[PDB]
Enzyme design. Sequence first.
Site, mmCIF file in Angstrom:
data_model
loop_
_atom_site.group_PDB
_atom_site.id
_atom_site.type_symbol
_atom_site.label_atom_id
_atom_site.label_comp_id
_atom_site.label_asym_id
_atom_site.label_seq_id
_atom_site.Cartn_x
_atom_site.Cartn_y
_atom_site.Cartn_z
ATOM 1 C CG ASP A 34 26.125 44.495 40.138
ATOM 2 O OD1 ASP A 34 26.271 44.431 38.901
ATOM 3 O OD2 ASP A 34 26.715 43.728 40.923
HETATM 4 P P1 LIG Z 1 30.287 46.484 42.356
HETATM 5 O O1 LIG Z 1 30.061 45.855 43.715
HETATM 6 O O2 LIG Z 1 29.266 46.042 41.324
HETATM 7 O O3 LIG Z 1 31.714 45.925 41.846
HETATM 8 C C1 LIG Z 1 32.222 46.397 40.570
HETATM 9 C C2 LIG Z 1 33.600 45.797 40.310
HETATM 10 C C3 LIG Z 1 34.635 46.495 41.195
HETATM 11 C C4 LIG Z 1 33.583 44.306 40.657
HETATM 12 C C5 LIG Z 1 33.976 45.976 38.835
HETATM 13 O O4 LIG Z 1 33.287 45.023 38.041
HETATM 14 C C6 LIG Z 1 33.649 47.377 38.344
HETATM 15 O O5 LIG Z 1 32.481 47.690 38.126
HETATM 16 N N1 LIG Z 1 34.661 48.220 38.196
HETATM 17 C C7 LIG Z 1 34.495 49.586 37.712
HETATM 18 C C8 LIG Z 1 35.348 49.870 36.498
HETATM 19 C C9 LIG Z 1 36.814 49.631 36.790
HETATM 20 O O6 LIG Z 1 37.197 49.390 37.932
HETATM 21 N N2 LIG Z 1 37.664 49.683 35.762
HETATM 22 C C10 LIG Z 1 39.043 49.229 35.853
HETATM 23 C C11 LIG Z 1 39.784 49.371 34.546
HETATM 24 S S1 LIG Z 1 41.423 48.603 34.597
#
Ligand SMILES: *P(=O)(O)OCC(C)(C)[C@@H](O)C(=O)NCCC(=O)NCCS
Lengths: 72, 50, 50
Positions: A34
Site C-alpha cells: 500500500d
Molecule cells: P495510504 O492509505 O497508504 O496512506 C499513505 C500515507 C498518506 C499514510 C503516507 O504514508 C504516504 O504514502 N504519503 C505519500 C508521500 C507523502 O505524502 N509525502 C509527504 C512529504 S512531506
Amino acid sequence: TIEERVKKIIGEQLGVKQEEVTNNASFVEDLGADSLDTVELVMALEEEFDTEIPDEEAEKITTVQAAIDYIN
Amino acid sequence: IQSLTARAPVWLAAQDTLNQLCEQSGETLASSNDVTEYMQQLLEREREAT
Amino acid sequence: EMENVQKKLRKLERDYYQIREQVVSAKAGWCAVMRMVKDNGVERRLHRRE
Ligand SMILES: *P(=O)(O)OCC(C)(C)[C@@H](O)C(=O)NCCC(=O)NCCS
C-alpha cells in the site's frame, strides 16, 4: 550483483521471495504494497544505496523494473 | 480532521461489534430499519420454535 | 546567514538517515509476524484497529 540488492530488498520488504518479483509487475497492486508499504519500500531502497530519490521521482517506480532502472 | 479523529474510536468499535453480531446472523445488515425487520423475523422464528 | 542553515541541514540529515535505518529494520523484522498473521488465526481477535 548490484541488482541483487534491489531484487533482495524488495523481496525482503514485501515478504515475497526473489523469484516472485517479475519485472512486469506493479508494486501498487501486484505486490499488494500500500501507500505506507510503498513509501517504506522506496525509503529502504534509498537508504540501502545511501542515495537520494525525491518523492516525485519515487512516484515513477511503481513497477518492478523501474527500481533498477533509476538505480543503474 | 480533529473532529473526525475524536469521533473515530466510537465508530470503529461500533463496526467491530456489528460485524461480529451480524456474521453471527446469516445476513448483512445495512439500516436501522433493516435491523427492525430482522427483529420481526426473529420474533416469528421464536413464536414458531415455542 | 546561509552557512548556519547549511549546518542545520547537516543536523537534519544525521537524524533522517538514522530514522530510515530504524524503519527499514523494523519492517524487515515485522514481516515475519505478518507471515504468522497469515496463519489466519488473525482476525479482530488479533488485529484491533481501533
Ligand atoms: P495510504 O492509505 O497508504 O496512506 C499513505 C500515507 C498518506 C499514510 C503516507 O504514508 C504516504 O504514502 N504519503 C505519500 C508521500 C507523502 O505524502 N509525502 C509527504 C512529504 S512531506
